[PDB]
Scaffold this active site. Structure first.
Site, PDB file in Angstrom:
ATOM      1  CE  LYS A 199       3.383   0.283  -0.924  1.00  0.00           C
ATOM      2  NZ  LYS A 199       4.593   0.639  -0.157  1.00  0.00           N
ATOM      3  CG  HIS A 200      -1.555   3.355   1.130  1.00  0.00           C
ATOM      4  ND1 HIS A 200      -1.626   2.191   1.874  1.00  0.00           N
ATOM      5  CD2 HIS A 200      -0.249   3.613   0.898  1.00  0.00           C
ATOM      6  CE1 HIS A 200      -0.406   1.781   2.118  1.00  0.00           C
ATOM      7  NE2 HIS A 200       0.468   2.654   1.539  1.00  0.00           N
ATOM      8  CG  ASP A 382      11.246  -4.761  -1.035  1.00  0.00           C
ATOM      9  OD1 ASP A 382      12.394  -4.422  -0.682  1.00  0.00           O
ATOM     10  OD2 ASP A 382      10.195  -4.217  -0.649  1.00  0.00           O
ATOM     11  CG  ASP A 389       8.099  -3.117   5.891  1.00  0.00           C
ATOM     12  OD1 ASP A 389       8.406  -2.043   6.427  1.00  0.00           O
ATOM     13  OD2 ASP A 389       8.226  -3.354   4.672  1.00  0.00           O
ATOM     14  CB  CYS A 412      11.854  -3.516   5.757  1.00  0.00           C
ATOM     15  SG  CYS A 412      12.161  -2.188   4.561  1.00  0.00           S
TER      16      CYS A 412
HETATM   17  C1  LIG Z   1      10.330   0.436   5.790  1.00  0.00           C
HETATM   18  C2  LIG Z   1      10.005   0.415   4.330  1.00  0.00           C
HETATM   19  O1  LIG Z   1      10.255   1.393   3.652  1.00  0.00           O
HETATM   20  N1  LIG Z   1       9.427  -0.708   3.860  1.00  0.00           N
HETATM   21  C3  LIG Z   1       8.963  -0.919   2.468  1.00  0.00           C
HETATM   22  C4  LIG Z   1       7.433  -0.771   2.394  1.00  0.00           C
HETATM   23  O2  LIG Z   1       7.132   0.647   2.256  1.00  0.00           O
HETATM   24  C5  LIG Z   1       5.988   1.211   2.991  1.00  0.00           C
HETATM   25  O3  LIG Z   1       4.686   0.522   2.897  1.00  0.00           O
HETATM   26  C6  LIG Z   1       3.562   1.191   3.504  1.00  0.00           C
HETATM   27  C7  LIG Z   1       2.241   0.576   3.138  1.00  0.00           C
HETATM   28  O4  LIG Z   1       1.828  -0.348   4.112  1.00  0.00           O
HETATM   29  C8  LIG Z   1       3.438   2.637   3.057  1.00  0.00           C
HETATM   30  O5  LIG Z   1       3.133   2.632   1.638  1.00  0.00           O
HETATM   31  C9  LIG Z   1       4.743   3.361   3.421  1.00  0.00           C
HETATM   32  O6  LIG Z   1       4.663   4.775   3.227  1.00  0.00           O
HETATM   33  C10 LIG Z   1       5.881   2.721   2.603  1.00  0.00           C
HETATM   34  O7  LIG Z   1       7.090   3.468   2.826  1.00  0.00           O
HETATM   35  C11 LIG Z   1       6.859  -1.509   1.179  1.00  0.00           C
HETATM   36  O8  LIG Z   1       5.425  -1.482   1.247  1.00  0.00           O
HETATM   37  C12 LIG Z   1       7.273  -2.971   1.029  1.00  0.00           C
HETATM   38  C13 LIG Z   1       6.748  -3.580  -0.296  1.00  0.00           C
HETATM   39  O9  LIG Z   1       5.680  -2.809  -0.987  1.00  0.00           O
HETATM   40  O10 LIG Z   1       8.690  -3.113   1.086  1.00  0.00           O
HETATM   41  C14 LIG Z   1       9.540  -2.242   1.885  1.00  0.00           C
HETATM   42  O11 LIG Z   1      10.669  -1.877   1.058  1.00  0.00           O
END
Ligand SMILES: CC(=O)N[C@@H]1[C@@H](O[C@@H]2O[C@H](CO)[C@H](O)[C@H](O)[C@H]2O)[C@H](O)[C@@H](CO)O[C@H]1O
Length: 597
Positions: A199-200, A382, A389, A412
Site C-alpha cells: 500500500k505504501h 470494503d 475514512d 470507517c
Molecule cells: C480505519 C481503517 O482501517 N480503514 C481502512 C483503510 O486502512 C488504512 O489505510 C491506510 C493507507 O492510507 C494505511 O494503509 C493504514 O495503516 C490502513 O489501516 C483502507 O486503506 C481502506 C481501503 O484500502 O479501507 C478501510 O477499511
C-alpha cells in the site's frame, strides 16, 4: 531557455537535439542532463515514438513560476502519444526509504518507475503514454471475470508477497524541502505490474510520497526535522487515464511526517489520533497543500482508484472510477503480506474503496462517478465507491455511484469524523447504501437520492454508528413494500432521521417525526433507476449540461411531493448549501433528494 527533441524512429543521439530538424533518438541523452535542466527548458518526445526498455528519472532541479520545465510531445498528434515503456528493466529501478517507521507496511525496497520526479518543482508533464509491463503478467480488466481458481482463461498473476514494486509515475520528496507546482496532464498510464499487496511503496499507476531527508535517531532530531519538512504543494493530476495497474490507481501524500500529524511517541508504528480532529496548522506544515485531482479515469486498478493521504483541503472532482479492486480477492490476494521485519499477515490490506481520503482535513470529492468496485463477495472487506475514512471534514457532494459490490459510502471506524455526504445519487449499490462501521460522530447525510434494488438495503447489516439523515429520497426498488431496518446500533446516538422521503416502504424510521411517504416512485421522479450502468466509452464523466442528460430520471416530476418539501439544512461541518447534483441553485425550501427541478 532551451528545447530538446527526441524521436524514437527519426532521431540520432549524435544530433545536438536542440531542433526538430536534428533530434535525439533515446531518453538516455535526457537522463544525462535531467538534474541540469533549467527554468523554461522543455523535453519534447515525438508523437509515434516508442522508448521500449527505457525510462525518465528527473531529480533535484526546478522551473520558476514564470519559466517552468515541460516534458511533452511534438509532431503529428494523430501518430499517438509517445510511449515510455520501462518494462521493469533494472535501469528503471531505485531505492525507496521513508527513513522512519510509517506503519505496519513494507516502506523500504527496490522500485521500478517509468517516470520518476524526485524533488523537482515547477514542472509540467503531459501527452505521454506510460507503461511498466511484465510480459509474464496478463490480467486485463477489458475481459476480466470472477473465476473460482487462479489464472483461468490464460490469465497469469505473480502473487509473491516480495514481488518488486512498480510505478508508472512516482513523485518523491526527500530533500526536506517543498516539492511544488507539479502538473501531470493527459497521460495514458497502463500495465504497471506492481506488487499486488503493498500500500505504501511507490506501487501503482501514480504515487506521490514524502521521505525524511535523514534517519531520526531520537527526540533531539525533531527541532531540525520539523524545520526541513519534505512535503508537496500545488500537485495537479488531470485528463489522465490509469488502467490495469497494481496496486494503487492514484495515491498522493503518504509521508514520514505522519509521525508528527498522527503524534507518534516512540516512532515504532504507535499512533494517537486524538478525537479524530486534525488541526489546520499540523496538516498544513507536515502534509500536502493545493492537491487537485480532476478529469482522470481509473479502470481495473488492483486496489483503490484514487486516495489523498495527509492532504490539507485537497479537491478531487470530475474523475471516473471503473471496476477497481480487481486483485482484492481470496484467489489473487493469497500471500502473507510483508512488513519491514517479517509478516503483517494473510489477508492484511485485502480491502479497497473507490475514491477517498486517508487522514486528510476537509477534502472535497465532487462531480465523480464510480462504477462496480469489485469483489466484496470474494474477499474484498470494503467494495464501496466512497470511504470517509480516518480523517476530519470529508465532503462528498454531487457524485454518482452505480453497482458497487458493497454500498455507496463507508464512514470507517472511531477516527472517521465530521463527514458531509450530500446531493449524491446511489443506484444499484449492493448489500447496503450507507456503511457505518463504528464511525466517529459529526456525520451529516442529506439531499441524496438512493435507488435500493433487491440485492441491497439502506444500511449495511454491520452498520452501528452515527448519521444525521435529512431530505434524502430512499427508494425501495422492489415489487412489494419493504419493512426496512432503519436503525442498527447506538454508537454516538446511532442513526437519526428527519424530513426524508420514503418511497414504496411499509414503515418509516421511529425518529422521523417529519416523514414524507409515497407508494409509487413514478409520482415522485421522472424515471428512477435509469442512469447508466458503466462509464462512457471515452472514460469522461457523462455530461450534466443541456436539456437532455442520462441523469434526467432523477428529476422530480412537476407536482412531485419532493418539491420544496426539504427542511433548510444547517450543515454540521460548515459546508454551505449552494446547488444540486446538476449545478441548479437551491431556491427557497430545498426539494427532497439530489435534484432541484
Ligand atoms: C480505519 C481503517 O482501517 N480503514 C481502512 C483503510 O486502512 C488504512 O489505510 C491506510 C493507507 O492510507 C494505511 O494503509 C493504514 O495503516 C490502513 O489501516 C483502507 O486503506 C481502506 C481501503 O484500502 O479501507 C478501510 O477499511
Amino acid at each position: 531557455g532551451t528545447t530538446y527533441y527526441v524521436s524514437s524512429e527519426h532521431g540520432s543521439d549524435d544530433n545536438a537535439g536542440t531542433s526538430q530538424k536534428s533530434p535525439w533518438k533515446t531518453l538516455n541523452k535526457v537522463n544525462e542532463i535531467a538534474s541540469d535542466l533549467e527554468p523554461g527548458d522543455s523535453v519534447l518526445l515525438e508523437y509515434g515514438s516508442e522508448f521500449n526498455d527505457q525510462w525518465l528519472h528527473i531529480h533535484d532541479t526546478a522551473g520558476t513560476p514564470d519559466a517552468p520545465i515541460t516534458i511533452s510531445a511534438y509532431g503529428d498528434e494523430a501518430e499517438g502519444k509517445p510511449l515510455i515503456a520501462s518494462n521493469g528493466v533494472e535501469g528503471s529501478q531505485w531505492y525507496q526509504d521513508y527513513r522512519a517507521n510509517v506503519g505496519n507496511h513494507k516502506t523500504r525496497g527496490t522500485v521500478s518507475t517509468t517516470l520518476l520526479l524526485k524533488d523537482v518543482s515547477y514542472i509540467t508533464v503531459s501527452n505521454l503514454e506510460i507503461t511498466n509491463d511484465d510480459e509474464s503478467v496478463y490480467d486485463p480488466i477489458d475481459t476480466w471475470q470472477w473465476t473460482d481458481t487462479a489464472d483461468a482463461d490464460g490469465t497469469s498473476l505473480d502473487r509473491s508477497a516480495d514481488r518488486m514494486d512498480r510505478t508508472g509515475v512516482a513523485g518523491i520528496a526527500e530533500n526536506g524541502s517543498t516539492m511544488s507546482h507539479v502538473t501531470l496532464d493527459n497521460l495514458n498510464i497502463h500495465d504497471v505490474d506492481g506488487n499486488l499487496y503493498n500500500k505504501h511503496m511507490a506501487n501503482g499507476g501514480i504515487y506521490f510520497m514524502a521521505h525524511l531527508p535523514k534517519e531520526r535517531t531520537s527526540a533531539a532530531d525533531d527541532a531540525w526535522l520539523k524545520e526541513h519538512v519534505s512535503r508537496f504543494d500545488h500537485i495537479t493530476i488531470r485528463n489522465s487515464t490509469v488502467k490495469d495497474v497494481d496496486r494503487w490507481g492514484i495515491a498522493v501524500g503518504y509521508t514520514a511526517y505522519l509521525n508528527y500529524i498522527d503524534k507518534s511517541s516512540r516512532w515504532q508504528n504507535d499512533f494517537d489520533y486524538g478525537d479524530g480532529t486534525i488541526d489546520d496548522d499540523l496538516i498544513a506544515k507536515y502534509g500536502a497543500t493545493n492537491v487537485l485531482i480532476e478529469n482522470n479515469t481509473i479502470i481495473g486498478a488492483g486496489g483503490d482508484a484514487i486516495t489523498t493521504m495527509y492532504c490539507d483541503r485537497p479537491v478531487i472532482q470530475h474523475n471516473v472510477g471503473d471496476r477497481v479492486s480487481k486483485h482484492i480477492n481470496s484467489v489473487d490476494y493469497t500471500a502473507n503480506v510483508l512488513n519491514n521485519t517479517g509478516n503483517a499477515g494473510v489477508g492484511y490490506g485485502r480491502v479497497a474503496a473507490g475514491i477517498w481520503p486517508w487522514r486528510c482535513k476537509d477534502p472535497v470529492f465532487q462531480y465523480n462517478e464510480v462504477y462496480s468496485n469489485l469483489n466484496a463477495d470474494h474477499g474484498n472487506g470494503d467494495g464501496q465507491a466512497w470511504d470517509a475514512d480516518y480523517g476530519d471534514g470529508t465532503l462528498y457532494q454531487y457524485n454518482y455511484s452505480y453497482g458497487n459490490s458493497f454500498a455507496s459510502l463507508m464512514i470507517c471506524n472511531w477516527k472517521a469524523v465530521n463527514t458531509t455526504f450530500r446531493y449524491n445519487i446511489s443506484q444499484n449499490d449492493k448489500r447496503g447504501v450507507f456503511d457505518l462501521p463504528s464511525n466517529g460522530p459529526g456525520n451529516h447525510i442529506y439531499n441524496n437520492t438512493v435507488y435500493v434494488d433487491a440485492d441491497s438495503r439502506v444500511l449495511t447489516t454491520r452498520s452501528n454508528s452515527q448519521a444525521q439523515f435529512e431530505n434524502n429520497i430512499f427508494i425501495n426498488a422492489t415489487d412489494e413494500k419493504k419493512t426496512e431496518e432503519w436503525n442498527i446500533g447506538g454508537y454516538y446516538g446511532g442513526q437519526v432521521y428527519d424530513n426524508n422521503l420514503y418511497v414504496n416502504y411499509a414503515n418509516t424510521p421511529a425518529s422521523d417525526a417529519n416523514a414524507i411517504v409515497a407508494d409509487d416512485v413514478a409520482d415522485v421522479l421522472e424515471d428512477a433507476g435509469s442512469a447508466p450502468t458503466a462509464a462512457q466509452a471515452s472514460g469522461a464523466e457523462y455530461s450534466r449540461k443541456g436539456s437532455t442528460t442520462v441523469f434526467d430520471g432523477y428529476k422530480p416530476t412537476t407536482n412531485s411531493p419532493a418539491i420544496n418539501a426539504g427542511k433548510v439544512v444547517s450543515d454540521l461541518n460548515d459546508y454551505a448549501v449552494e446547488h444540486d447534483f446538476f449545478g441548479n441553485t437551491i431556491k427557497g425550501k430545498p426539494d427532497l433528494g439530489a435534484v432541484e427541478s
